[PDB]
Amino acid sequence: SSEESQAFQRQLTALIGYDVTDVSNVHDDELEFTRRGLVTPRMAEVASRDPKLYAMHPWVTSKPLPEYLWKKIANNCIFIVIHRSTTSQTIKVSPDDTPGAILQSFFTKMEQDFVLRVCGRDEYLVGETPIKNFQWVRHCLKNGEEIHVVLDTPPDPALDEVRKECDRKFRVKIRGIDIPVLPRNTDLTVFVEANIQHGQQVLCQRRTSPKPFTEEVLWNVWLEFSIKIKDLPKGALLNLQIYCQLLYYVNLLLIDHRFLLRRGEYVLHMWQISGFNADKLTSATNPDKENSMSISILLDNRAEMPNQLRKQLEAIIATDPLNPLTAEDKELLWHFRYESLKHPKAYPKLFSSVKWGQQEIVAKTYQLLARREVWDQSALDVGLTMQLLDCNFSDENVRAIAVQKLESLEDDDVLHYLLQLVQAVKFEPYHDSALARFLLKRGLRNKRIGHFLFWFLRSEIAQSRHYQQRFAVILEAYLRGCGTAMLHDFTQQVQVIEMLQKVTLDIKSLSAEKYDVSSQVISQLKQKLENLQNSQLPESFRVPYDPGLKAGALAIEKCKVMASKKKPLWLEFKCADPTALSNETIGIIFKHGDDLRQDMLILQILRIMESIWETESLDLCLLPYGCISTGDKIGMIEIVKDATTIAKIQQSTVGNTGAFKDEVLNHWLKEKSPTEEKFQAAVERFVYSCAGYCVATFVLGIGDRHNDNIMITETGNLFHIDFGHIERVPFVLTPDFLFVMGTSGKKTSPHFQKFQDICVKAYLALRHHTNLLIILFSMMLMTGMPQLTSKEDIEYIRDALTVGKNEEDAKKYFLDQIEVCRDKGWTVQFNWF
Ligand SMILES: CC(C)c1ccc(-c2nccnc2N2CCN(S(=O)(=O)c3cccc(-c4cnc(N)nc4)c3)CC2)cc1
């Protein structure tokens, strides 16, 4: 242990926002044992990285260029503009031309130590991929934009260097609970519920004699369980709960990370309920020992299948993931488990029908995971895989076969699911896990993933007492192998970020619920930023939410506090890249108040929906604006250029409490549209945007929004914001939207025909992916929400997706929705006062 070694680990602590060397809140080896464990994988991957692709992080895809998109090409001709000092020149290019082929089609057109960086960004067009298959190139086409690139020497790989390094029954004694203070009522009653638990499947359950709720309550009882030790499954949780009604909980893994039976004396500080979720599963103990409830415990311990059964079975397998299997359903799946293995789709339900509390049966389960041959051959199906990592499955080998499948994902896809897989670590019974390692693999393999992984992790470590230890050990594994380049970038980012959390907090306090932003408050802000620039704040930091963009110095004059309840900052920066084609500013918001994580989740689903729509050549021009959480109820938000609220547009001359008129929206588009044809573009863009956000929100159950939370770009692109948050209407199709389509109050139109038609395809498109959507929603709710319901709240989505139903009744159901919204018109909007 050098110094060196410490100062490093010190900077590491500073990045993570947690100290993984601290052993104050542990009762065993596991975290430390996971740190040592993760080294081998980290290394393996570090020592395997192609150093120059690593350094240049090409952002590519194996996916076919969508149709829409194809019809935006001259004649197998794509234009590119290169630059060298204050020089330029275009090259015609064909979609399949490699970069190398291009670069050489230039040295011919009149050394190899030169490469194609995109202008303004830290992004590269290198490696063996068709230009069509780079994402920037795809982003350029979508947005009607010209592709601009600089020529310069490759960044040095050496910059990215890493630094070296029994048959008896189970019982538990319940000695007693203790708590420094009570006053919440006066004397009620309370017992302890000991639960043996696997995939949230309760295996066995005992309670204690009631007693009255004194600051201390001893028992002091042995509690015997049905189950025998030998039949305890790896991953079993002793789950201890205190009822009056449910008030505190805490879990103890019964089998440890060396497969030993947990044996001895414990004092487990519990977690409290704040009135079915991932926080309830945790092995973590409450780190706040001053105030927490405390519990105390001692551990001393061939042939075929008849027509209609096959059909009963297949009926069951066909079912959705929320369709509950009866004991019949289960006995059937198990008994015919060999038939079952022939369908990858039957797996969740099959392994949900394993009696894990029986060792002989567990044994048999492994026996048939030995015969993996159909699973292995099957085409990856992220929904199906993802199901094998929720709270229902808590066996190492099951979850491993899932992860096995994710290995075949290319980078492109990993990013789409990165946040949910990170969150899936909540359901892991152990700190080291296939899933953990896979994230760590992939993050270390590709810079882009490695960046979003860093913040996704840090996001939780900063504000999940229940999991911050675990995720911290993992964040460390990453940072220990990601390269000094990136430590530097991160360290800077964190520093910028922390600075701005202070400024944002100091300011919020300096403002009460008077809805006005007084100049001596804007005096304070304007100043504070100067007093930081100046200090302290570095020459340039990399934009999380979009790590292609570097930001440098503030544009103070353009910065402002926002005249909303939360008083968020609205910060604009210059772009530290001297090469970009514009002067448009880099705009970031900061915000204390709401839990930003919920927002990240809805956005990432929104991207999963967009990509689905690509697989059927649909483009609904969502804007999932960038949004990274950073700390307790605080994070950051992308500023979407040339955009206003819809509320803001209604407060025209048509002002505050007296509103709203149907046209208005329309003039604003024309007012802001240079030519009647660009205006024309906008109504297209709008018809689409509207389609997207209508189906999306409906499905996600966030349909019904006041329009101060709905926005639109000058160019016609509408978009919800502030998912916050948390007489109805299924969505915000208000008469002002409808005219512009040209139809109010209840007629019809070319565009409202178009609109209707587009939704119908979109809804249906999503329905072709019911299961994936169901698992994500379900996962979204358990890993990121306040009050939920292991049935009802999650079952919302099966309904909104109209599971059951032929293609027809679905389409019908949706146009009703539309008609509901019209009935109706301005009712709800008005109702918000
Ligand atoms: C930016 C201006 C046009 C604005 C001002 C106030 C409001 C607003 N009005 C009523 C109620 N709430 C409001 N919010 C302002 C701040 N936001 S936010 O910071 O959490 C947020 C969330 C999502 C998107 C945005 C955003 C991004 N880019 C731009 N250009 N504008 C807004 C801002 C919450 C909602 C919306 C937009």
Side-chain angles (χ1 to χ4, degrees), residues 710-740:
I710 293 194
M711 295 191 63
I712 171 160
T713 62
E714 285 179 14
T715 49
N717 204 137
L718 188 71
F719 59 106
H720 284 41
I721 53 157
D722 205 33
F723 302 95
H725 261 88
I726 237 133
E727 288 289 305
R728 345 276 197 167
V729 69
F731 35 110
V732 187
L733 181 60
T734 45
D736 61 327
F737 286 30
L738 290 158
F739 177 65
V740 169

Side-chain angles (χ1 to χ4, degrees), residues 337-461:
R337 48 187 184 271
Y338 277 96
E339 186 58 24
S340 307
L341 255 192
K342 301 161 169 170
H343 306 264
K345 265 200 272 297
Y347 280 45
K349 298 186 148 97
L350 184 55
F351 303 107
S352 282
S353 69
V354 168
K355 290 161 172 263
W356 300 92
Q358 286 194 57
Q359 189 230 316
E360 270 170 72
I361 268 152
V362 174
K364 290 191 195 170
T365 308
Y366 291 4
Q367 276 159 33
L368 93 154
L369 278 139
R371 196 215 181 208
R372 252 198 290 283
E373 316 204 283
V374 163
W375 172 256
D376 294 319
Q377 277 148 226
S378 54
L380 178 49
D381 163 340
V382 176
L384 184 60
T385 299
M386 215 79 83
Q387 289 168 254
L388 296 166
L389 318 170
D390 68 37
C391 57
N392 307 296
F393 303 100
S394 132
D395 183 79
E396 180 186 42
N397 278 45
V398 173
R399 301 181 68 91
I401 74 138
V403 183
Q404 189 219 287
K405 280 291 183 153
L406 307 184
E407 299 282 1
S408 91
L409 294 156
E410 79 200 7
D411 286 338
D412 192 26
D413 286 305
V414 181
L415 303 158
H416 288 284
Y417 303 109
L418 184 63
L419 166 64
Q420 307 213 249
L421 299 173
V422 168
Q423 298 291 319
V425 176
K426 294 187 180 171
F427 307 122
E428 286 306 332
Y430 291 106
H431 297 131
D432 191 301
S433 70
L435 185 48
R437 297 196 175 192
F438 167 90
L439 294 178
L440 171 53
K441 269 205 218 77
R442 298 301 297 265
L444 279 175
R445 176 176 305 161
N446 166 307
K447 274 204 174 158
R448 201 175 152 69
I449 301 146
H451 169 95
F452 282 101
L453 178 53
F454 168 91
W455 292 105
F456 295 168
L457 287 183
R458 192 169 208 282
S459 150
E460 297 276 356
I461 290 160

Side-chain angles (χ1 to χ4, degrees), residues 31 93 104 111 116 136 184 198 220 231 297 334 360 384-385 389 393 399 419-420 488 584 615 633 636 649 681 744 748:
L31 289 166
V93 176
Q104 148 272 319
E111 299 201 68
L116 262 21
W136 190 245
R184 37 162 281 278
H198 197 255
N220 131 256
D231 286 335
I297 61 158
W334 176 248
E360 270 170 72
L384 184 60
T385 299
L389 318 170
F393 303 100
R399 301 181 68 91
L419 166 64
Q420 307 213 249
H488 170 291
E584 284 168 73
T615 89
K633 296 225 169 111
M636 74 200 88
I649 284 170
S744 318
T748 162

Side-chain angles (χ1 to χ4, degrees), residues 621 623 642 668-669 672-673 678-679 681-690 711-719:
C621 341
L623 289 162
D642 285 300
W668 189 80
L669 287 300
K672 297 305 208 163
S673 312
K678 282 162 96 159
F679 172 88
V683 185
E684 219 66 29
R685 191 131 288 256
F686 178 93
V687 178
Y688 281 116
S689 298
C690 197
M711 295 191 63
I712 171 160
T713 62
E714 285 179 14
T715 49
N717 204 137
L718 188 71
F719 59 106

Side-chain angles (χ1 to χ4, degrees), residues 562 570 589 591 625 637-640 645 708 711 721-722:
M562 271 198 57
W570 162 292
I589 289 180
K591 190 185 146 177
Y625 55 93
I637 294 173
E638 181 193 342
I639 295 176
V640 188
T645 273
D708 59 3
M711 295 191 63
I721 53 157
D722 205 33

Side-chain angles (χ1 to χ4, degrees), residues 70 75 95 122 148 284 413 429 446 563 711 727 730 744 753 759 810:
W70 266 122
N75 211 243
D122 292 350
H148 285 72
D413 286 305
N446 166 307
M711 295 191 63
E727 288 289 305
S744 318
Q753 254 127 280
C759 293

